[PDB]
Amino acid sequence: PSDGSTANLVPEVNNEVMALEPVVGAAIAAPVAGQQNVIDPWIRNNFVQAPGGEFTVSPRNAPGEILWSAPLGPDLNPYLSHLARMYNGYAGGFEVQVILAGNAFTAGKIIFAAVPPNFPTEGLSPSQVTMFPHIIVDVRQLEPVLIPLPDVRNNFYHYNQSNDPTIKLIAMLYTPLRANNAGDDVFTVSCRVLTRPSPDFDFIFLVPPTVESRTKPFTVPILTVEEMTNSRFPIPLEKLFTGPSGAFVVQPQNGRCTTDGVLLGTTQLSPVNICTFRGDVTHIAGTHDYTMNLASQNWNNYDPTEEIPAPLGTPDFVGKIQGVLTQTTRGDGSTRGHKATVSTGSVHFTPKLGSVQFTTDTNNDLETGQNTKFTPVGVVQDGNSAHQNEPQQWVLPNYSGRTGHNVHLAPAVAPTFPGEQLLFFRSTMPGCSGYPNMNLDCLLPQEWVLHFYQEAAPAQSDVALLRFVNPDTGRVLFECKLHKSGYVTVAHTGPHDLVIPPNGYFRFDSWVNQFYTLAPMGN
Amino acid sequence: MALEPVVGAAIAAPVAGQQNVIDPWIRNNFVQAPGGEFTVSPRNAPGEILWSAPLGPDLNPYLSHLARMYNGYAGGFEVQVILAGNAFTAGKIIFAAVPPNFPTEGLSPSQVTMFPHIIVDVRQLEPVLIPLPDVRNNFYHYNQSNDPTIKLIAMLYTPLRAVFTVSCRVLTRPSPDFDFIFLVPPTVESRTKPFTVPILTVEEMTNSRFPIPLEKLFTGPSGAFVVQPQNGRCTTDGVLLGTTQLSPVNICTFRGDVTHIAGTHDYTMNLASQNWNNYDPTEEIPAPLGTPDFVGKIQGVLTQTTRGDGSTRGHKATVSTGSVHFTPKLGSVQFTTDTNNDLETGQNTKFTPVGVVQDGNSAHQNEPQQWVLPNYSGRTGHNVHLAPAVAPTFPGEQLLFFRSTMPGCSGYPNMNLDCLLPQEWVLHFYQEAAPAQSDVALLRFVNPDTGRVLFECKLHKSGYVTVAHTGPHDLVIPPNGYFRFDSWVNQFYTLAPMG
Amino acid sequence: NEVMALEPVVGAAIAAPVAGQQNVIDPWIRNNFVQAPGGEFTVSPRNAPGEILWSAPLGPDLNPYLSHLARMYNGYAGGFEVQVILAGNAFTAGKIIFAAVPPNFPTEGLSPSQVTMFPHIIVDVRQLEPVLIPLPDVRNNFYHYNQSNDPTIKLIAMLYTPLRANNAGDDVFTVSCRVLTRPSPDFDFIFLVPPTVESRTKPFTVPILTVEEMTNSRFPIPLEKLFTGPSGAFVVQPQNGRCTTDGVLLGTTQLSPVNICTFRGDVTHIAGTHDYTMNLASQNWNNYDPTEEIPAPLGTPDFVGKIQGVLTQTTRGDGSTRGHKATVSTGSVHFTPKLGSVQFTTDTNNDLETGQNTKFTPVGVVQDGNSAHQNEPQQWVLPNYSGRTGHNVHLAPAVAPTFPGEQLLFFRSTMPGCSGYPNMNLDCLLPQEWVLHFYQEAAPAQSDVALLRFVNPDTGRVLFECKLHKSGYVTVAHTGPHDLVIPPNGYFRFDSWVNQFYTLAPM
Ligand SMILES: [Cl-]
Ligand SMILES: [Cl-]
């Protein structure tokens, strides 16, 4: 029966069982629910992979790490997830199926535990997890693990739009992963979580779809790398790059946006205003320099009291940006345009205070009362100093110049998992003069900022697993982790420009946590 | 009583993959169809089909969302029609069920009575109920197929006597024999996502004909001009037209190798692709994607980088569209620069646009004519594979433009730049690829503070917007107002006056 | 566990009241599993979750017995039982999902999560016993017609968990899979009909001819060798020998293997030179119509170079005949065959009369010896068929491999040289006899790729396999330029239609 397959090398099934009493589903809610609803019985009789539903046990993982966790709710099941956008509430339990068919040469144990509502999960030790109803499963177990997840609660049913807690199911690494395959291979255990609603599960109230935030699902645009634009300078994207970031500090303030659509730093939605300035301009006596008193991006007065580091779209690197000042006179419509340059490392670059200084090609022909716009074009470098040294993309300017320090900054960004580096979306800035360092990396393409902003989809966990696919060949090129904080990471060591098919796109496959181990991409 | 009962999906059980159940409450409430708005106005005459819909999940917003989870369906509907008339209004509306594969084109009101029908007076208060059974000759219908179904049609049976527009609404609910058939994942390639319009504000969006933000909404008469832009031209279901591409930054830009013209400060650019590939002049496009779509002088900056040492050069430059040397369909355009030397020949060169200029000795505000197309192949022929021209077709209506102001670099230029669709709307339609359920998508502009509707407009499938107004007018809009897609309608819809 | 969540689906029994007749299939065919023609795929450690390793639609082409029978029947109805075999061992880990995708649902782009949402089975790489999958004929009509190509249910095989195994030495361990099929009891054919009349049932084939026995489709010369190479620098876009698998000719391609670089028409002298202008008439000697949706008259040369041959003329009344060494330059501005005129350089400025029909017989290519050696005949540069006065119109598409590790496979011949140092390499995408074969035997393509096997009949050994794309070009698994070392009697054999994800073994 098992001769030549598995070969008794492997635990077949688990004996342990969760010490939970039975718990009623939605039947209790019938006298006070608005309606008695029905779920397609095929959805109830068939396991499907949960959003989330992937996690890994690798040698990088350490005992105590929660490899997978989820609260009870419709988001446990993709069919129920889409249905839930059409209902106001729910009640009842789930059957979860976990697949752990590790290679026979692997060792290690996982604990699954049910933690009741309103108990804090945020510091649990392995000892402590044992005090809940729990099951301990060997990472090599062949038959899937079946865990019933009852809807422990103190009310008749749950509302989608509220934050009353539910039971949380936890999977934690109980014993580190060891292996004794003789060769130098990993044998990471790839695990799958599938679910189906219990018979007592039901939705409560029929309501207009998609208007409830907590049920909006997360997506990542189908756009190709060439079809998107840099979020730190109005340029198209060109390549994907990963490299080591230990030396310098990756802390941009443009193109910073969270997965559920909260903008951060100096980030705004318009991809054309990403290094623009608008306001009234003043000549500086005896020089070809002009001082600009800043208006907003929509030509309103600028309010420095706002909880932002600087006006939205203010450059987030130190360098000399060359462009054009343009001006129009209200009465007659006379227009003027002059070569201009802004140095963000200059002591007179104080956009938080409301003033920026340009160096122009005239000392007249710029009126003092007219609206003036700086259209950026490129970056420049002083040719007498070291080649490729002027534009430092990862050095933040002093938004208030010599007065005070920078405030309300978006956090810095770094890989936290062993073997991982940031993944940058790389664009090459036009050079106007000199020998400038023309590489510009952003953490998110501008179109992703647009998308996340509009679809304010709540993050089901802290990391969204993406796979990059070649649609011609159908093959996955690499996988990466998209963090809620709005940055991407990959499994690689060393600098590398990615070799990408022109048709490649990012495909969202599963929610994971920070302990997910990515397949190595490099070379 | 005029039709027999018609079985739904129960008959399909021996040949369907699965047996499914739909939430029975969905059939206990009449709900407005996604294309359940139509209008009767004195502009309409008998013979015009004022409203129509095919049987299918798209009749019901609940079934519409459910349909993303199923492969097919079978069964009928009960439809309810509501007419907002008054006692001073006269006329009759006939609703009729026309069976699959019968041609509606040319029907008289007399003939429409020969179908199962109801004749309802425009001044009735109480809603009228129509049964719509799933007459067919197969076991069931596939969502991904355009197989025909029974159609419900509404038209004026007697002429309307009454500015007074009669607002009408169509609501539906599934019959008890209706059911979905095969449970399937809601994928993107299904093209079952319903059509929407981005929530972005006019202020926060970008012009699709020049890399600048939008500023205001403008309506005006277009009898003088020929409205035929080639950028920002896109279909509601995501088909790009003309020279339109997706990058909001690469509009009115050029990339290629550059060559000096002896004795002048003028240069010739041999055009590479937007991706820096070779450019193929034989593509079925009027010109390379992002080519300027108006006649004028566009000033910017030419940029060049020498590979090997990192040498970079930048020079003020200017393109005159409609100049005889502007031939981007053939692969070359001519710039006038501020040097005759420093632009090297071997290296790749990029023109970054900034603004337009005007010769000050000529008539003021006459140089950039946004509604005059350049001759993409110069004198050596005329333009080909153009996106169609655009004009209002319904009496009382004008185009609605998304207006921004181009920066002026010198002179007295006409800085007015109107596009048909925001660039972000082009992006949205491309990615969502939502199939159009009719030829016109009715949009309403909403003030989110109060929930109030400020005006309505028609977004045509061809990718242009029209509104009910006469005369030029800059629209006065709350800065945070957004567009909302409300219903599929047809060409006979009468818009509320706006102004 | 191992059960696909599908309801039972009636086969041809439901069709009895509306079918004309009741038929019977040989019971041995019903009781014995047979390998689907493209029923092989492989699980390697390079594979990642979500990759579709194999797919097939339900239908008679999955079974060569049923495929042959369908040529004599009008329709069919019912399902199959599929047997899939996995060549694992106890020391492997990993999961494969098989899924039933309904008739009109697109497979293109599915994530692993979503594939789980179809009726499905999850199979462990260590499973020894074959997996039995019922594939029911989900449909919305009573039965299917052969000529109507109705869409059917699809079987999907996708990598669900990566393969975890040791390798032995440098040989990387892989799990080979095979897909076997046999008709369900409810499957049956419908109406007996004349056995080879119905078009959509003709099977695709490839000539048994040897490379030496075939002919180049771009110049009237025999083939000599098979050549594969990287093609990224240049643009592979020939206009002769371009034909689709189901027999539609493309570009300037025509059927006669001798008229591949010929010209016919009436000729006119250009005063003071040894040049002549030929007013072109159709290859069949008729009036020439430029309106034809073709790049140029059929058989017009599709490369830039100087072709030397012989002009021949015949006076109708007297019967006199004249023949003169001549040369055509396809890159010269006076080479405008789309407009109807071509310019020759001859060895006389006398003895070529007007109004008489004149035929250019091509012989070879020539090179200016004072220029760089091997620089004049650019085979992969198309001439400008309308000279300066416009662009080429209605071209056959350009051709490139899409799969990593794959390069074009060219049928290579060596052009005769007449003078100078010309590049005598000439590569075509299809032999002329393959064009002839596809055109006559107009077999419908069951997918975008026909898998071919190249066989040495002496030893019986297969030397390589290649992909014949429906568009009419071939690709192989190789990197770098290489002349193939082939036994002189080797032939191409058609094996199976496959899906676009089929990965072929390297040389
Ligand atoms: Cl989904
Ligand atoms: Cl209209």
Side-chain angles (χ1 to χ4, degrees), chain A residues 1-215 217-523, chain B, chain C:
Chain A
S2 74
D3 297 339
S5 71
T6 75
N8 297 337
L9 295 168
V10 160
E12 303 274 341
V13 65
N14 59 302
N15 49 354
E16 292 201 339
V17 167
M18 279 207 173
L20 289 159
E21 301 269 24
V23 173
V24 296
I28 280 281
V32 297
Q35 295 175 350
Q36 268 165 75
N37 308 302
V38 176
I39 287 175
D40 192 331
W42 200 99
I43 298 176
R44 290 185 180 286
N45 302 138
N46 289 285
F47 283 105
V48 299
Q49 173 178 309
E54 294 191 31
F55 75 87
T56 53
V57 186
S58 85
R60 303 191 160 113
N61 295 116
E65 299 173 353
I66 290 185
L67 309 184
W68 178 97
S69 84
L72 180 145
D75 295 334
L76 279 176
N77 179 296
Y79 280 118
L80 296 190
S81 283
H82 282 261
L83 279 176
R85 280 182 290 125
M86 195 173 103
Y87 292 97
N88 193 29
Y90 64 93
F94 292 76
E95 183 72 23
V96 306
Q97 163 178 71
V98 175
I99 296 181
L100 306 165
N103 181 284
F105 286 103
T106 59
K109 305 285 185 166
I110 298 166
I111 289 180
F112 298 92
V115 306
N118 296 107
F119 185 95
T121 311
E122 278 77 48
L124 283 173
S125 87
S127 170
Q128 298 188 309
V129 164
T130 313
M131 298 187 255
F132 300 106
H134 72 267
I135 282 182
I136 300 183
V137 182
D138 190 284
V139 75
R140 303 166 293 155
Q141 189 154 106
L142 194 173
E143 280 161 35
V145 173
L146 269 48
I147 313 160
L149 192 50
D151 191 9
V152 175
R153 66 186 190 278
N154 71 334
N155 48 29
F156 289 94
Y157 62 88
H158 303 289
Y159 292 105
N160 271 330
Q161 277 292 104
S162 75
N163 267 330
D164 75 317
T166 63
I167 283 192
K168 288 187 181 175
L169 183 59
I170 304 186
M172 194 181 63
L173 183 76
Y174 192 43
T175 285
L177 174 81
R178 255 44 157 176
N180 48 13
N181 57 320
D184 212 1
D185 297 65
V186 69
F187 288 8
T188 286
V189 189
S190 278
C191 300
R192 298 298 183 266
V193 181
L194 305 95
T195 81
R196 69 173 180 194
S198 298
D200 51 32
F201 186 91
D202 202 3
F203 289 107
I204 281 301
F205 207 94
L206 213 47
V207 291
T210 302
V211 306
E212 279 183 337
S213 70
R214 283 281 187 263
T215 62
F218 179 65
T219 54
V220 166
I222 323 178
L223 294 184
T224 287
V225 192
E226 313 102 8
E227 319 183 313
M228 294 180 286
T229 67
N230 201 12
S231 61
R232 296 182 59 205
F233 205 80
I235 301 168
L237 293 184
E238 304 200 1
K239 63 192 77 150
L240 299 193
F241 169 79
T242 193
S245 42
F248 57 95
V249 162
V250 179
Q251 201 172 9
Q253 305 293 304
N254 286 320
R256 307 285 269 103
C257 184
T258 198
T259 290
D260 54 355
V262 171
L263 302 176
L264 304 186
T266 52
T267 300
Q268 87 286 16
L269 304 168
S270 194
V272 170
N273 282 357
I274 298 184
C275 289
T276 317
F277 299 97
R278 297 163 209 264
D280 274 349
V281 72
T282 286
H283 183 211
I284 297 173
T287 50
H288 305 265
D289 300 355
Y290 283 77
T291 284
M292 211 175 101
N293 303 305
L294 288 163
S296 200
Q297 320 77 33
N298 43 46
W299 276 283
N300 279 59
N301 200 359
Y302 170 56
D303 183 16
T305 309
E306 296 191 42
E307 305 281 326
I308 64 188
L312 308 187
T314 287
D316 59 325
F317 57 92
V318 313
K320 286 179 172 186
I321 302 169
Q322 197 175 289
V324 174
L325 283 170
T326 50
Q327 186 182 69
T328 300
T329 289
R330 305 262 192 189
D332 57 357
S334 50
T335 56
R336 310 148 210 93
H338 292 297
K339 183 168 309 193
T341 287
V342 55
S343 176
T344 58
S346 165
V347 189
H348 296 299
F349 185 74
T350 56
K352 175 70 179 184
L353 273 49
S355 89
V356 162
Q357 194 164 307
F358 298 85
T359 63
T360 81
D361 75 4
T362 45
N363 50 345
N364 55 312
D365 212 13
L366 280 189
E367 282 141 8
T368 59
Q370 309 307 317
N371 290 98
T372 312
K373 166 176 180 172
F374 181 60
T375 298
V377 176
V379 71
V380 309
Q381 183 259 350
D382 169 54
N384 301 320
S385 45
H387 288 255
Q388 274 87 36
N389 82 321
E390 171 85 40
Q392 311 177 63
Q393 69 191 354
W394 303 122
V395 172
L396 276 174
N398 288 292
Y399 291 120
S400 290
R402 74 176 196 266
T403 312
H405 322 263
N406 288 10
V407 298
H408 301 117
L409 285 184
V413 161
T416 52
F417 202 81
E420 267 176 30
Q421 302 184 150
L422 289 185
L423 175 60
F424 298 104
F425 303 79
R426 179 186 306 288
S427 184
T428 286
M429 307 176 72
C432 294
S433 165
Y435 299 96
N437 184 347
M438 284 152 61
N439 282 343
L440 193 56
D441 302 316
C442 56
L443 312 192
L444 303 165
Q446 186 58 25
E447 281 81 358
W448 287 24
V449 177
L450 269 169
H451 183 73
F452 300 162
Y453 172 86
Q454 304 188 69
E455 77 168 8
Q460 307 305 284
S461 73
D462 55 358
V463 178
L465 178 64
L466 309 186
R467 295 202 165 82
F468 195 81
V469 182
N470 188 336
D472 305 339
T473 76
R475 289 183 197 175
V476 170
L477 271 289
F478 66 87
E479 44 196 52
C480 66
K481 293 156 86 170
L482 164 65
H483 301 249
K484 320 163 51 173
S485 300
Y487 69 99
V488 183
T489 298
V490 299
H492 187 41
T493 289
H496 185 245
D497 288 29
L498 301 204
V499 187
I500 285 170
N503 282 318
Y505 71 107
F506 289 92
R507 178 188 79 205
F508 173 41
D509 278 359
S510 183
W511 292 100
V512 299
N513 60 34
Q514 80 257 24
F515 304 115
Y516 189 85
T517 299
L518 285 174
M521 67 176 290
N523 317 328
Chain B
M1 71 97 73
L3 272 189
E4 278 176 13
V6 173
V7 164
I11 187 167
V15 290
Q18 297 180 3
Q19 299 271 98
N20 306 69
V21 183
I22 198 172
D23 184 336
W25 286 93
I26 301 180
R27 44 175 85 95
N28 271 325
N29 187 34
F30 278 110
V31 68
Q32 183 181 307
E37 295 196 25
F38 75 90
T39 197
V40 187
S41 84
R43 320 191 89 76
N44 298 124
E48 297 178 334
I49 291 189
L50 306 178
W51 181 87
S52 89
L55 187 152
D58 306 358
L59 280 179
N60 182 303
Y62 281 118
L63 302 178
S64 190
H65 180 53
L66 273 173
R68 287 159 77 182
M69 258 174 60
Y70 292 96
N71 198 43
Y73 67 97
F77 293 74
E78 295 170 1
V79 57
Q80 169 187 81
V81 294
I82 290 177
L83 301 205
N86 72 22
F88 169 51
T89 284
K92 310 285 185 163
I93 305 279
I94 177 169
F95 296 86
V98 56
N101 288 110
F102 183 101
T104 57
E105 197 171 311
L107 283 171
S108 80
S110 178
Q111 300 179 306
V112 169
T113 67
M114 311 177 83
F115 300 106
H117 69 83
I118 54 172
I119 300 171
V120 55
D121 189 301
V122 289
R123 65 197 193 278
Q124 291 191 2
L125 282 75
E126 219 61 33
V128 175
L129 303 184
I130 322 168
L132 197 70
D134 185 9
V135 171
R136 63 181 190 277
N137 67 331
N138 45 18
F139 283 94
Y140 62 95
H141 302 295
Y142 295 112
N143 287 327
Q144 304 280 350
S145 73
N146 59 7
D147 176 61
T149 61
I150 206 170
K151 222 192 278 183
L152 194 65
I153 63 173
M155 78 183 274
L156 269 168
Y157 181 45
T158 71
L160 173 86
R161 320 280 187 205
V163 76
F164 191 80
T165 285
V166 178
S167 275
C168 302
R169 303 286 189 264
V170 175
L171 309 92
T172 71
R173 63 178 191 185
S175 293
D177 48 8
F178 181 92
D179 202 7
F180 281 112
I181 289 188
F182 202 103
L183 271 173
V184 75
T187 200
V188 176
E189 274 60 28
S190 296
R191 287 188 64 201
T192 49
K193 206 192 175 206
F195 179 73
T196 55
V197 161
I199 62 174
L200 295 179
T201 286
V202 186
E203 206 175 36
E204 58 207 8
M205 287 178 286
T206 290
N207 194 303
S208 61
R209 300 185 65 203
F210 199 79
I212 48 180
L214 290 188
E215 197 162 298
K216 58 190 172 292
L217 296 183
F218 173 82
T219 313
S222 60
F225 306 108
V226 158
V227 176
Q228 201 171 5
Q230 303 299 303
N231 288 327
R233 190 71 85 103
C234 189
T235 311
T236 42
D237 49 8
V239 167
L240 298 172
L241 310 180
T243 58
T244 296
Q245 48 83 55
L246 304 171
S247 187
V249 159
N250 276 349
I251 303 182
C252 274
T253 79
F254 304 91
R255 293 157 208 259
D257 272 2
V258 72
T259 287
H260 186 213
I261 289 308
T264 42
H265 300 54
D266 305 350
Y267 278 78
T268 287
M269 188 182 287
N270 322 310
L271 294 179
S273 182
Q274 291 72 7
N275 317 300
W276 272 318
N277 301 122
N278 289 15
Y279 163 66
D280 195 342
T282 75
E283 299 190 45
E284 295 271 306
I285 326 169
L289 309 186
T291 295
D293 57 324
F294 59 96
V295 177
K297 289 185 174 191
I298 302 168
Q299 169 170 327
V301 172
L302 276 169
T303 285
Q304 190 174 72
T305 299
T306 296
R307 47 188 58 261
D309 44 349
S311 293
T312 56
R313 299 155 289 273
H315 304 307
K316 167 184 292 199
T318 292
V319 192
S320 179
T321 314
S323 158
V324 293
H325 299 294
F326 186 82
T327 52
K329 180 62 176 160
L330 300 176
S332 77
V333 297
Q334 197 155 117
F335 300 71
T336 74
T337 81
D338 73 5
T339 49
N340 53 13
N341 44 358
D342 216 7
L343 295 182
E344 312 189 358
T345 45
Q347 314 297 343
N348 286 1
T349 313
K350 166 177 179 172
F351 179 70
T352 289
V354 166
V356 291
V357 304
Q358 189 262 353
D359 166 34
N361 294 318
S362 181
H364 290 184
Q365 281 89 36
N366 85 359
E367 168 75 29
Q369 319 162 62
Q370 66 184 329
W371 305 127
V372 182
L373 275 172
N375 294 289
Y376 285 124
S377 285
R379 295 174 162 173
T380 62
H382 53 81
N383 311 313
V384 294
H385 306 305
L386 284 185
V390 163
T393 52
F394 191 94
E397 278 179 22
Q398 305 182 129
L399 271 54
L400 185 69
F401 295 109
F402 302 79
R403 187 192 279 291
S404 44
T405 181
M406 302 177 91
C409 298
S410 178
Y412 297 81
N414 175 31
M415 285 146 54
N416 278 341
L417 187 52
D418 301 320
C419 67
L420 300 193
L421 313 166
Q423 185 60 25
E424 289 77 359
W425 285 22
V426 177
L427 262 172
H428 183 73
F429 301 161
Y430 174 80
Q431 306 187 67
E432 174 182 80
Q437 290 160 58
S438 79
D439 290 349
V440 176
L442 185 60
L443 314 187
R444 298 202 175 79
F445 192 85
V446 182
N447 180 316
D449 300 333
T450 72
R452 190 192 204 280
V453 180
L454 303 174
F455 64 94
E456 47 191 46
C457 61
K458 299 182 197 169
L459 162 58
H460 299 247
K461 181 167 63 162
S462 299
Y464 75 95
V465 181
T466 195
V467 72
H469 190 75
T470 56
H473 175 62
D474 277 348
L475 276 75
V476 56
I477 62 182
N480 57 326
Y482 66 104
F483 285 97
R484 177 171 80 196
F485 166 62
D486 275 1
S487 178
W488 298 99
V489 304
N490 61 29
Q491 61 183 310
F492 305 107
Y493 196 97
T494 311
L495 287 168
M498 169 263 276
Chain C
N1 75 98
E2 277 282 324
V3 165
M4 208 156 277
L6 279 152
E7 295 300 343
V9 169
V10 162
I14 204 172
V18 293
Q21 79 187 6
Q22 300 267 70
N23 313 266
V24 181
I25 284 174
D26 188 324
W28 202 92
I29 300 173
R30 289 180 175 286
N31 299 330
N32 286 282
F33 283 108
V34 173
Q35 185 187 297
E40 57 188 0
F41 68 89
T42 303
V43 174
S44 163
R46 301 181 296 152
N47 292 119
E51 295 183 340
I52 300 286
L53 310 181
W54 179 91
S55 90
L58 185 169
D61 298 63
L62 271 49
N63 190 312
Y65 284 121
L66 304 175
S67 157
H68 183 67
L69 280 168
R71 292 163 46 74
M72 80 177 188
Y73 290 100
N74 200 32
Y76 64 83
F80 292 1
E81 190 178 344
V82 177
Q83 162 177 109
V84 57
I85 284 174
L86 286 294
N89 68 25
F91 301 105
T92 61
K95 307 281 196 167
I96 293 169
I97 286 180
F98 299 89
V101 175
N104 280 107
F105 194 87
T107 312
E108 298 87 49
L110 273 300
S111 89
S113 161
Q114 304 180 310
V115 173
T116 295
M117 305 175 56
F118 305 108
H120 73 264
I121 302 176
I122 299 179
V123 181
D124 191 285
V125 160
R126 306 192 302 283
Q127 179 173 354
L128 184 54
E129 215 57 36
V131 177
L132 289 181
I133 305 169
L135 188 51
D137 186 3
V138 174
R139 63 185 191 277
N140 68 332
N141 49 15
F142 285 97
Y143 61 92
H144 301 299
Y145 291 108
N146 285 332
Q147 286 288 99
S148 65
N149 194 27
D150 288 334
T152 59
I153 195 173
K154 307 175 195 171
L155 269 196
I156 286 309
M158 185 190 62
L159 184 85
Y160 192 42
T161 285
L163 170 76
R164 297 286 195 257
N166 280 333
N167 313 302
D170 66 319
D171 303 293
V172 178
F173 184 85
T174 76
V175 182
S176 278
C177 304
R178 298 294 185 273
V179 180
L180 283 301
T181 195
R182 85 184 187 202
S184 289
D186 51 65
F187 178 93
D188 205 10
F189 280 107
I190 288 298
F191 208 99
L192 274 304
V193 300
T196 55
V197 171
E198 292 199 326
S199 65
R200 292 213 53 91
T201 72
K202 181 143 201 51
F204 180 73
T205 47
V206 163
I208 45 172
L209 292 177
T210 286
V211 193
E212 319 169 304
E213 317 183 324
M214 281 177 276
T215 284
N216 189 297
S217 56
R218 297 187 59 202
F219 202 78
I221 53 177
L223 294 182
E224 308 180 352
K225 37 188 174 147
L226 262 45
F227 173 77
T228 182
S231 45
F234 64 114
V235 161
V236 178
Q237 197 171 357
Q239 301 298 303
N240 272 299
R242 292 298 290 279
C243 183
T244 194
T245 280
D246 45 350
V248 177
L249 302 175
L250 306 177
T252 58
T253 296
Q254 54 82 60
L255 290 169
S256 183
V258 295
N259 287 353
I260 297 284
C261 273
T262 65
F263 293 108
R264 301 161 196 262
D266 290 338
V267 72
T268 286
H269 187 237
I270 293 174
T273 51
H274 294 264
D275 303 353
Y276 285 77
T277 285
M278 185 182 295
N279 312 306
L280 288 174
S282 314
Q283 276 303 339
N284 61 81
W285 286 110
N286 274 336
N287 265 303
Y288 177 59
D289 171 48
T291 316
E292 287 190 74
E293 290 277 319
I294 316 185
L298 304 179
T300 287
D302 58 328
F303 50 77
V304 164
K306 288 130 177 181
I307 297 172
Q308 187 172 278
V310 184
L311 287 167
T312 286
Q313 198 170 49
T314 304
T315 308
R316 309 185 313 92
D318 69 22
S320 175
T321 50
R322 300 152 292 279
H324 293 297
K325 176 147 40 193
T327 318
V328 180
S329 184
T330 57
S332 185
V333 292
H334 303 296
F335 181 74
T336 59
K338 179 63 181 160
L339 322 177
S341 289
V342 166
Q343 196 156 297
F344 293 64
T345 310
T346 66
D347 67 4
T348 310
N349 53 24
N350 174 11
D351 209 21
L352 279 189
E353 56 203 59
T354 313
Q356 293 304 347
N357 303 88
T358 306
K359 166 178 175 268
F360 182 63
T361 293
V363 181
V365 292
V366 73
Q367 202 263 344
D368 165 33
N370 301 324
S371 174
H373 292 188
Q374 290 88 30
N375 199 7
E376 292 264 323
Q378 311 166 72
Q379 60 184 346
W380 299 122
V381 165
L382 273 173
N384 286 281
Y385 290 110
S386 293
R388 308 164 169 175
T389 61
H391 51 304
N392 288 335
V393 180
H394 309 310
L395 293 185
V399 163
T402 44
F403 271 95
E406 273 181 21
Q407 304 177 153
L408 291 186
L409 183 70
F410 300 100
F411 298 96
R412 178 168 266 187
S413 44
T414 294
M415 279 163 298
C418 299
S419 161
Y421 302 82
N423 165 63
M424 283 158 61
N425 272 340
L426 189 57
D427 302 305
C428 64
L429 302 187
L430 298 167
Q432 184 58 23
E433 290 78 12
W434 287 26
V435 174
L436 264 167
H437 182 65
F438 300 165
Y439 169 73
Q440 302 177 65
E441 285 214 333
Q446 295 308 284
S447 73
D448 289 352
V449 171
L451 180 68
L452 306 183
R453 303 263 181 83
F454 190 87
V455 185
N456 169 21
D458 306 338
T459 77
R461 83 196 317 280
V462 165
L463 293 177
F464 63 97
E465 44 190 40
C466 62
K467 303 205 300 195
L468 174 57
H469 298 238
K470 179 221 313 183
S471 299
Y473 70 91
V474 180
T475 51
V476 287
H478 197 70
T479 304
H482 186 244
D483 277 347
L484 300 189
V485 285
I486 43 178
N489 60 326
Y491 69 117
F492 292 85
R493 179 203 73 205
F494 171 67
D495 193 82
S496 51
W497 299 97
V498 302
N499 45 353
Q500 196 164 1
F501 304 152
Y502 189 102
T503 194
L504 71 171
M507 293 275 300

